[PDB]
């Protein structure tokens, strides 16, 4: 049942990294689960676009010979893969305001530090870079030489949050 | 037909106990009814998240080796299983206002007294703890040494409600 | 194909007779049409509730041993089957205002006179009880000893309506 | 696959000719395409009504022995098939205002002149009756003894529209 | 499975080129993917229209003997294929305002220059006609005798955009 006919996943070019990555991951997981022979997914790729994207596909259809080239064309035309220094400045911009728990903040900061080139930064320097931008209410009790991985920091922050 | 492809049940991290319990129960009942071999449900778990949850899964995917560990990770990260005394204080907080029948109140108070540790409280002390927070209009006619289980209390309250 | 997996019929406890009767009729017609072996419909009844009803089912699940007991539990907990005299008073309350045709009024009055105990009232006394609460515009031309069943009254009212 | 289980076509009694005709045509085309043995469509007709129509069906279910009688009951109870002179007066009522092309006007006037009794009016008198109620901007250039069928009138009106 | 029964693509006559072209492309790709024997698609074409289009089909049904004639009737009645000079004037009308990247503008201008008669204009004159209507911020750095195809212009514009 790999006719790519019944799928409720869509895309319309909203120009943001998260929506594009969600769409690409959902398509590739669907192809891995239901079963496509890696050629029928090119003949039925036009059943998922709407609005501004369908005009783009009817424009640039004649430069797609495989599947990986089409997925690379989507990722290159709708995400310009931002350089190094703007990510660091955006990262140090925001502080952790009150009425915001640890889980949302740690999820957003770990989603931001994945657009750097891979293999440059291990876990310890990443946690040391994260630890400065936390509020005083947690930081009075969770001082260093006590955590080594993000799971322990999340656990102790959750205990200090739900305790009082 | 266990490809976990066609399912209209979703979750997006609303941070509440009831939505999480409803989602977990619906997934587990779907797996019991249609038929999954307990390994294909891990390869297709990513077809049910959207929004804030998909970034969380793309973050913490590498710490899930079975199915029960993933369901425990969901229940532990999105519900911090509140302690004993806050449930008792929240329970004695609200009184039963007028223009509210017995069924809604009894359903909410029985949904609240299930987050305690199991095996501490049987039925009689639970009904004796519930009986104080009822309005005078029912309580003038349904005096004690007449009911022993919640079905009889609901029945006599329904008769006194629909009679006049 | 009786896995009770794909069905777009739902219920959430709106506390009204018509919604409950519509939901029960749609479920029972679905079971008669597609084919269930009268035991699989109990294992998959939890795929149709949402919101306030799912907490109610997780509360009272342990008092359902068959299918008819579960359908009776729904009908008894969400409809208190109103007594005799309130139906008669509600029935004589409303008059037929202008800018309202015969079909809507006759449908509502025949939907109200079905909650009485069966076998007490035949067709002739029911039409004689209905005939008093009609407007003067129809009643100047449709005088008695001319109709015996509701079809003839609807037919002559429709002719007098669409004629002028 | 004729269980009349998966169909996204519905009806709720909006009291208009066009919605009823669309619903009847969609049901009959579905029965012609998928394959029903002309008896299973009566046992599953109750899976398509909602709201005010389901009470009507639970009222008048016991006067339907075949399929054509049920479709005639729908067409007779929800469309009173308007008489001759009101259609002619409604037809000559409206004129063709500016900022309205030929296609919409011709479609509406041909949809109105189908409720007359059939076999009374051929094509030539119908076009001669239509030609009076057109604006001066088209009528200065499309004078008679030049068109004989509606296709030619639509074609020359479209040329005069898109030319200037 | 070519009964044209389950399809979530619809059309209602919005009178625009893009919606009509999207609808025609989606239908033809569906027929190429799932499998129709080129005669069953005419018996089930009426399961996709709604509103104003269904009255049009019930009007003009008797002038469709094949599939290509029906698709040509749709394209001719709902798109009047605009002449040459209005496309050129509309094309030179708009300039590229700030806070608008290169991809959206190039997609719209390449979607507009496809309604001309084919075989008149190759790639070089098209890029030379496009290059005049760009803002000064890109045009200070991307001067000519450096690009020959639209891919290189998009690439250098994307580098100059995401660099500063």
UniProtKB/Swiss-Prot annotation, chains A, B, C, D, E:
Stretches that traverse the bilayer? none
Give the main localization category.
Answer: membrane
- GO biological process, alphabetically ordered: behavioral response to starvation; mRNA transport; muscle system process; regulation of neuronal synaptic plasticity; vesicle-mediated intercellular transport
- UniProt signal peptide: none
Tell me where on the tree of life, at the top rank, the source sits: Eukaryota
Deletion consequences: Strong reduction in the number of synaptic boutons at neuromuscular junction in third-instar larvae.
Q: List the Gene Ontology MF annotations in alphabetical order.
A: identical protein binding; mRNA binding; structural molecule activity
Instruction: List, alphabetically, the GO terms of the cellular component aspect.
Output: extracellular vesicle; membrane; postsynapse of neuromuscular junction; sarcomere; synapse; virus-like capsid
Keyword Hydrolase belongs to the record = no
Q: What induces it?
A: Up-regulated following stimulation of E347 brain neurons.
Keyword Nucleotide-binding included in the entry's annotation: no
Where is it made, tissue-wise?
Answer: Expressed in a specific population of brain neurons, named E347, that are necessary and sufficient for proper body fat storage.
Q: Which UniProt keywords apply?
A: Membrane, RNA-binding, Synapse, Transport
| Subcellular location field | Extracellular vesicle membrane; Synapse
State the protein's purpose.
Master regulator of synaptic plasticity that self-assembles into virion-like capsids that encapsulate RNAs and mediate intercellular RNA transfer from motorneurons to muscles. Arc1 protein is released from motorneurons in extracellular vesicles that mediate the transfer of Arc1 mRNA into muscle cells, where Arc1 mRNA can undergo activity-dependent translation. Intercellular transfer od Arc1 mRNA is required for synaptic plasticity at the neuromuscular junction.
Under the subunit heading, UniProt states: Homooligomer; homooligomerizes into virion-like capsids.
Q: What is known of its domains?
A: The protein is evolutionarily related to retrotransposon Gag proteins. It contains structural elements found within viral Gag polyproteins originated from the Ty3/gypsy retrotransposon family and retains the ability to form virion-like capsid structures that can mediate mRNA transfer between cells. Tetrapod and fly Arc protein-coding genes originated independently from distinct lineages of Ty3/gypsy retrotransposons.
Please report which protein family the annotation says this sequence is part of: Belongs to the ARC/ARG3.1 family.
Give the protein name, as stated in the record.
Answer: Activity-regulated cytoskeleton associated protein 1
Q: Which gene encodes it?
A: Arc1
């Amino acid at each position: 049942k790999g006719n790519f006919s019944a799928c409720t996943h869509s895309f319309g070019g909203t120009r943001d990294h998260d929506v594009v990555e969600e769409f690409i991951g959902n398509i590739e997981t669907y192809k891995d689960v239901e079963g496509i022979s890696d050629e029928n997914a090119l003949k039925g790729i036009s059943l998922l676009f709407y609005g501004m994207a369908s005009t783009w596909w009817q424009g640039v259809r004649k430069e797609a010979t495989t599947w990986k080239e089409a997925i690379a064309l989507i990722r290159e035309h709708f995400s310009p893969t931002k350089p190094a220094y703007q990510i660091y400045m955006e990262f140090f911009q925001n502080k952790q305001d009150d009425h915001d728990p640890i889980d949302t903040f740690v999820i957003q900061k770990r989603a931001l530090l994945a657009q750097l080139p891979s293999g440059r930064h291990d876990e310890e320097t990443e946690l040391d870079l994260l630890f400065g931008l936390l509020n005083i209410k947690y930081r009075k009790h969770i001082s260093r030489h006590s955590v080594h991985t993000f799971k322990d920091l999340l656990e102790q922050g959750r205990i200090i949050e739900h305790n009082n």
